[PDB]
Symmetry: D2
């Protein structure tokens, strides 16, 4: 039905192993990755990556989120960077195969006691320029997140707040920070100066584990491919660090000086893409899913119940994809928390939700712009078929494949409750 | 509430080891779920009265066994008529009507090598009288099952064949027998004379384990409550044997002389019902589900994929039931093989499938009698509502409960592919 | 296959086909069940002790000799019936039958004597008849007391007090027979030497359909605590009048052993029944089959995980010795013990290897029958001048008795457990020895 | 306080996810650093005074890279290492043995090259402990190295360096005939795609752990420290992850051979390794290693598993083992006990070589002998206890597991004892 060649690719012999030791022993350098790269790449925009032509190459290389570092540069400089990112992204709207949403993240300068005056003005600039995400620098407690949230004025409540943990207090007050944040960034640069350098891996692994448990996005950042600022190829420790951040459970990986000021920005993005695909296939899904299942509390929320049912169904048939209809991105995020091997194709009419779901591992957003059908069930079926035809065009799906389809019983967000098993025709 | 997590051995269910599970079993933790292991009662002089059969149905009898080792065809035709009269006396209330299967247990080959001439005549009688199941005595090899199947003819294709394993050869050729049978009976009476008595528990536990792995019904039979032929209460070894057969994984438990000729036929049924409910709550679902999940092969069949997704969803929300629409019983059987704690409420129009699904643990058949609605989606919804109304009347469901609803995309058998999370209103 | 490949070449494929070894090496409990084989014959000596109630059908010296040969390890005297004179004669007849085999020390089988009390009746605590019966037990040197209707910790303190200063060595097994005993189980087990699941009264005091829950819970808690647990009443009931038991009865005996019972019991089946010797033989045959079907892989992992961390060297040595025995499929673990405690701590980890306990205490040799898999050897030789030589002679006595009983063969590996100094409480050494 | 240190809350966790969630930057390491550090000797680390600081910083094995330098250059490096090591021999209870490893130039465009035959002969003549054989592609390459060592170099350990696709594909046959493996990531990262090296590293470490044979992770672990005083975030992560993967040894090349901060690079690997060792999830690791090790009738194998099980049961501070060749200590090390394996030996070479096995702390016994063999055994066990107390491994009240044999000579380990300190 599938063949022996299918079960040799994407580390499938290591995936079927009964123990983690046997899983390690079965990892094969000849077993090629087949799935689309699921860990998003965040690239910092700067002099080396600001031009429209350079940004087109970075989008082609795999950049999903553009980071604007407000520690340097004026509002005029950042507005031009945003315009250049949007021009490069929209240059592909002519091809359904190549077009892809790209999120814009504003990384704040940081705090002084409460929110700094500059952070109030920069956060206001972010709302006025329609940024998708804020990477809030030096978050130490829950009230720091509340201050950032308050500064997103009356118009920016939909912006995602990713709290950067950069010091001892942020690590010790992690639970209260995660509770009020949309996600976390393990900001290793400052963390490695604030706490002993030999302890950063403990903070990284703990925070990734807690974010995976909570079902909230976690970003691993700083010096991942540092030597690539001046060299065309990274060190053995750098490729290892990127692979290990993905294996740890990071939803996103980041590039700072490598893309902002370095001599090889496109090559750094290509390297993170290549390593992430290899590491995602080496994830031990058998124990990971069992542990996420056991640790996740019992739930009476139908979206959560449908998500675990759909992920279980996808593993049973080695589904190529889980197609989900989502307005806010929440139904796709709840599928992503169970770490399915199947790609989560999220069909949405919200351009902002399509950009923001790049924060969740394995979510592939498809922005739907057709006019709504008069009969709701027909409009649902057209979106499901749009996800199928996009998957066929992009290589995720072929005729005869099985896909899992996740929908709700009525229009509007919060009603996901249906899982279907569909044969691709 | 806290009261919910104290009942049905839920503290023992959440235990991390089987030792801790045993240590947490509580005699004060009352069973809440409906009794899932079916009871087979042998019909005889003590249970032929139509009025006594009505009491046995109320006590919990699901399958009526006709032992063709004794009595003429005229005697068995009267037993069938009496069973049907008692069963159909409750048809006036469709929301509470309980289907009861009729099983024909053959005399056997005796000294011969294959199908006896009396068995050919008895099997023909079974087809002519519309029996649901055949318990084929002394099955020693796959060709014995083929001979029974051939003697049933073209009109008996829908009859389930349960092979009785009663000797050393049947145990040694178990795998080839199970492959061609619908299920197995561990016929301990003859097995305990054919092999050393001290080895029967090994054959019983092995056969139940292999049937559970194959997802095929297994019956534990003979002397389970033997002393109740003459005494009002059973021995400590008898209650232990019934509880251990359920814990082993038996889909059905049986009564022979206890209901056929004894003085306490209704009390013997009530005793098996009471013990089975206690033992089902003491099942260690945590390890059992994990092992059944791991041992079940990967599948591209949408019914199989939907079934595991629905069982996983039911465990996530502590669903009171999985309501499934089924024509042949197959969709309910595939749910049952994963041993959900949630009751599998199977709604069917087939009177025969409603009787036959009693062979699968935890399947509660509801016979739907209404003619099809003009709109197929409304006909589906009406059957789901019938499952809910029957469930509320019978005590399976209450307002506020969560239920998993399993349906298909088109009419006819073989198209189950949808799982839905529904709140009971 | 790789985890058992070199051992399969050395010991042979026939070795790994016996005693349910394919089911023992299974990775899941489901696969373990699927691999159980009626053609896989038991090889190990029967480890679950049999308690037989003495009465008119089993009182004669000649009948008792046949019951000892059939497998009786503990003789129960039911003080609910019979006078002190009747029970003293039963004790004398048991001792005469047991000592008729003392002429061959390498094969002599110790047999314990247990006194089962009448109980409190309608009273709240220790009855006056129980005080007199317990005093009789001490005067007649009984090894164990099965205390009827224990409902709380103070009931076992009262039994202990009635035994007096001369009965400090007697083991107290509390009988749980009602709802209160089940609910106060933890406090009762804490002060008792062990427990008896007394299913007769328990099945009348609580709903009959709940007894299996109480049995499985109490056996699990006793296994966790490392204290003996007895399953009792109606196990082979039909054998009181019939030569063969029912299918439910053989299943009940097998399931009590699989549950984790250290001992199984016969009441009317041996006391007044027509087939006392056959009932003992039946429990022996079923127990050997069920012991081989135990899923040691998960059982040992769970007993290790659940057992608390310990700084007691006897406890630490015991787990190391059981781990070593599993690693090499050891035929036996030979242990030197004064009180039986070192053998009990090995037994709590449920090794497949027989625990051959060499002791000079005749009472400890009888009492260790309460612990599953402990085979007591009574050493009669006087102490050597050099203590290290005396230790070695006792280990050699265990090996020679083991060879002359079928437990050991040349080429087998045995684990030897000893201590660093004389006296009880100093076990701290584990040795791997090849049998020559 | 005991259960708050060395990541003990994360150690008691029921799942790997919960283990990760419980890792605490405030939980300080207490155990001695288990993973050995291999430092490459060169112009930056050749002086006797510099070597004394590197030994104090944690260097356990000195690597001589025969790709550069003459035989005269390497003989002087060996003499300087031995002078620095023996400068601490005046205090036998704290003396740290240091192994000398010869890393070959390799076959180049050719089997065994003529330069490798001469270099291996030099190694035997100068008493090297280990050979890191470059570019091992098959079992016959190991046999050729073994033959070039001759009858005098029978005791030298051969660690095969896997540096290309063929070495990875023929890994099982190479490991079978080798004493251990080195994941030589420099050449491996050029021979196979750079993004696949982590797969080869994790697979080889897993297979070596399964076989109970030493595995070394090597190259660019702290690369930036060649010119900078502090490493990058990816470098500290790489060192920690090599230890978590299961590497027995970690290595420094240019960082110690030619860099500006050789002592600081050793101190950094020591600091990270201690943190990572405490974060190892022993609950699942021991269970998997125990399940996967085959059933055995060898008494040393049977005693080792019993001793490791006993150590976990009582939270033993150490397992003291008497060993002639190092084999009894290696069999204890394969189960990854949290308890330090204190190996007391009379063989100076075995004391140096056991640094290849994680958690083996070699003590070179140089005390006068005893007339009664049993008394000589007791004296070696007391020397292990006294050295353990002096070094901080043991305190009064601690429990230790003692592993010995029934007769003199190698191959007779069969006894395990539980001893209370003082
Ligand atoms: O390791 S065990 O052997 N059996 C553990 C065990 C039992 C039951 C389950 S199950 O999840 O419900 C399950 C049932 C049927 C399946 O098809 C199936 O896939 C799963 C799973 C595991 C054990 C461990 C202990 O710690 C102990 O005190 C007692 C026992 C014990 C020993 C022998 C027995 O036969 C027995 O009844 C109990
Ligand atoms: O028992 S272990 O500890 N491994 C633990 C282990 C690692 C990974 C998984 S995961 O399913 O991918 C998983 C990932 C993230 C989760 O959130 C998650 O829920 C699950 C699962 C388990 C061990 C066992 C071995 O046999 C061995 O050779 C090596 C190791 C090893 C290796 C790495 C370590 O960090 C370490 O401490 C030890
Ligand atoms: O993930 P979200 O934001 O809850 O959106 C899921 C929603 O999408 C749907 O599938 C389709 O809804 P719309 O037709 O309003 O887009 C709903 O049935 C469901 O509630
Ligand atoms: O379990 P079976 O026999 O495959 O029946 C399941 C079938 O029942 C249905 O849910 C309802 O079908 P009908 O309307 O024909 O009764 C189908 O969609 C599905 O294929
Ligand atoms: O099991 P117990 O009662 O603790 O007895 C174990 C004792 O037996 C011995 O092995 C031998 O002691 P004895 O010489 O007193 O018989 C002691 O070293 C050890 O302390
Ligand atoms: O680990 P190895 O090389 O087998 O050495 C272990 C040996 O050391 C001893 O403990 C002591 O032996 P020596 O007295 O010869 O040093 C032996 O009993 C044992 O066989
Ligand atoms: O701000 C950051 O990204 C950091 O400190 O790593
Ligand atoms: O035929 C039967 O039912 C038996 O033998 O048990
Ligand atoms: O007293 C007893 O032994 C009983 O009730 O089982
Ligand atoms: O030879 C080496 O050490 C390498 O290539 O890493
Ligand atoms: K910033
Ligand atoms: K029949
Ligand atoms: K009594
Ligand atoms: K070299
Ligand atoms: Mg920062
Ligand atoms: Mg029969
Ligand atoms: Mg009683
Ligand atoms: Mg190289």
């Amino acid at each position: 039905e599938l063949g022996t060649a299918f079960f040799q690719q994407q580390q499938l012999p290591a995936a079927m192993a009964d123990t983690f030791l046997e899983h390690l022993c079965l990892l094969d350098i000849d077993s090629e990755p087949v799935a689309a790269r699921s860990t998003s790449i965040i690239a910092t925009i700067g002099p080396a990556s600001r031009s429209v032509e350079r940004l087109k190459e970075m989008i082609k290389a795999g950049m999903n989120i553009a980071r604007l570092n407000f520690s340097h540069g004026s509002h005029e400089y950042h507005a031009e960077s945003i315009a250049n990112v949007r021009e490069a992204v929209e240059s592909f709207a002519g091809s359904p195969l190549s077009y892809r949403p790209v999120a814009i993240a504003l990384d704040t300068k940081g705090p002084g006691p409460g929110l700094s005056e500059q952070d109030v003005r920069d956060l206001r600039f972010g709302v006025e320029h329609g940024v998708d995400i804020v990477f809030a620098s030096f978050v130490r407690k829950a009230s720091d997140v509340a201050a950032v949230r308050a500064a997103l004025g009356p118009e920016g409540h939909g912006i995602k707040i990713i709290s950067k943990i950069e010091n001892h207090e942020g690590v010790k007050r992690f639970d209260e920070i995660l509770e009020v944040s949309d996600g976390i960034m393990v900001a290793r640069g400052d963390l490695g100066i604030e706490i002993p350098a030999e302890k950063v891996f403990l903070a990284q692994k703990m925070m990734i584990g807690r974010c995976n448990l909570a079902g909230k996005p976690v970003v691993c950042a700083t010096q991942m491919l540092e030597s690539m600022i001046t060299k065309p190829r990274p060190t053995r420790a750098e490729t290892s660090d990127v692979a290990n951040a993905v294996l740890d459970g990071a939803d996103c990986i980041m590039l700072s000086g490598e893309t902002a000021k370095g001599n090889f920005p496109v090559e750094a993005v290509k390297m993170q893409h290549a390593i992430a695909r290899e590491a995602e296939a080496a994830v031990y899904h058998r124990q990971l899913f069992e542990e996420l299942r056991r640790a996740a509390p019992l739930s009476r929320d139908p979206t959560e119940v449908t998500a675990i049912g759909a992920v279980e169904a996808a593993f049973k048939c080695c589904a190529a994809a889980i197609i989900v209809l989502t307005t806010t991105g929440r139904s796709a995020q709840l599928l992503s928390r169970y770490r399915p091997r199947a790609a989560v194709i999220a069909v949405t009419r919200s351009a902002q939700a399509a950009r923001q779901v790049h924060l969740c591992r394995g979510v592939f957003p498809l922005l739907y712009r057709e006019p709504p059908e008069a009969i709701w069930a027909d409009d649902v079926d057209r979106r499901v078929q749009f996800g199928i035809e996009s998957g066929k065009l992009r290589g995720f799906l072929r005729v005869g494949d099985l896909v899992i389809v996740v929908t709700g019983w009525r229009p509007g967000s919060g009603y996901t409750n249906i899982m279907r098993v569909l044969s691709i025709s």
